[PDB]
Each structure stands twice: as C-alpha cells, then as structure tokens.
Amino acid sequence: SMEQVAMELRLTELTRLLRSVLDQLQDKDPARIFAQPVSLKEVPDYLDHIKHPMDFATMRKRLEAQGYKNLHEFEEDFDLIIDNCMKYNARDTVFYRAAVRLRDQGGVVLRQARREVDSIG
C-alpha cells in the first residue's frame, strides 16, 4: 500500500532524527565510558546486578534496524545507560560521575528533540 510507504518514510525520518540525537548524546561522553556493553569477561557478576544492560553501540544497532517506534522507547534506552551505571557504581567513582554529567547534559538535547518530534509529527 501507499499508506505503509508514507508510514515507512516517517519511521525513516524518525530514525534520521534519532540518529542525530544519538550523536549529540554520545558527544557528551568524551571518555567513552558508555560506548560499549560492560564486558562479562571483565565483570562476570554484572547480570546478577543489572538486568537490562545498555550502551551506545547496542542503541545504535537498534536504531539502524529502525527498531525505535517513538522517542519514548529511545529515551528508555538512554535512561538505562545512566541508571544502570548509577546503581552498579558508587557515588565516589569516575563512572558514577560520568553518568551524572551525561544525564545533565543530555537533558537539553532531549528537551529539543521532544519539541521536534511533536512539531514535525
């Protein structure tokens, strides 16, 4: 159908907007603390602590499979990156601190993306 294609152009454009959002969020992590999944070789107990691991490469794979239906699903995954870190790591660690800074700085980007998603539909 013609509608399914119209829809697919929207999802494709959402994917386009979310790609740019993902790039902006990832720039707020210059130390690359959140770039890749926590290694289960190097933290073998990790899944005993954290039930839904997340990281920027894993989000990117989902994005490129147009696996995000709306901004809310994308935000959910960003929030997991931050929240998982703030649980596993103590307050006085470079890792916890990095998550706080990413949350704070990401807020601004996510604020405008919500307005852009509502505005452009």
From Swiss-Prot:
Q: Where is this cross-link: Glycyl lysine isopeptide (Lys-Gly) (interchain with G-Cter in SUMO2)?
A: K41
**Native source species:** Homo sapiens (Human)
Tell me the protein's name. Answer: Bromodomain-containing protein 1
Top-level taxonomic group:
Eukaryota
Cellular compartment(s): Nucleus; Chromosome
Query: Quaternary structure per UniProt?
Result: Component of some HBO1 complex composed of KAT7/HBO1, MEAF6, ING4 and BRD1/BRPF2. Component of the MOZ/MORF complex composed at least of ING5, KAT6A, KAT6B, MEAF6 and one of BRPF1, BRD1/BRPF2 and BRPF3. Interacts (via PHD-type zinc finger domain) with unmodified histone H3. Interacts (via PWWP domain) with dimethylated and trimethylated 'Lys-79' on histone H3.
Q: In terms of the whole protein, what range is present?
A: 555 to 674 of 1058
On tissue specificity, the annotation reads: Highly expressed in testis.
Q: What is its biological role?
A: Scaffold subunit of various histone acetyltransferase (HAT) complexes, such as the MOZ/MORF and HBO1 complexes, that acts as a regulator of hematopoiesis. Plays a key role in HBO1 complex by directing KAT7/HBO1 specificity towards histone H3 'Lys-14' acetylation (H3K14ac), thereby promoting erythroid differentiation.
Domain named Bromo: residues? 9-113
Query: What taxonomic classification does the UniProt entry list for its organism?
Result: Eukaryota, Metazoa, Chordata, Craniata, Vertebrata
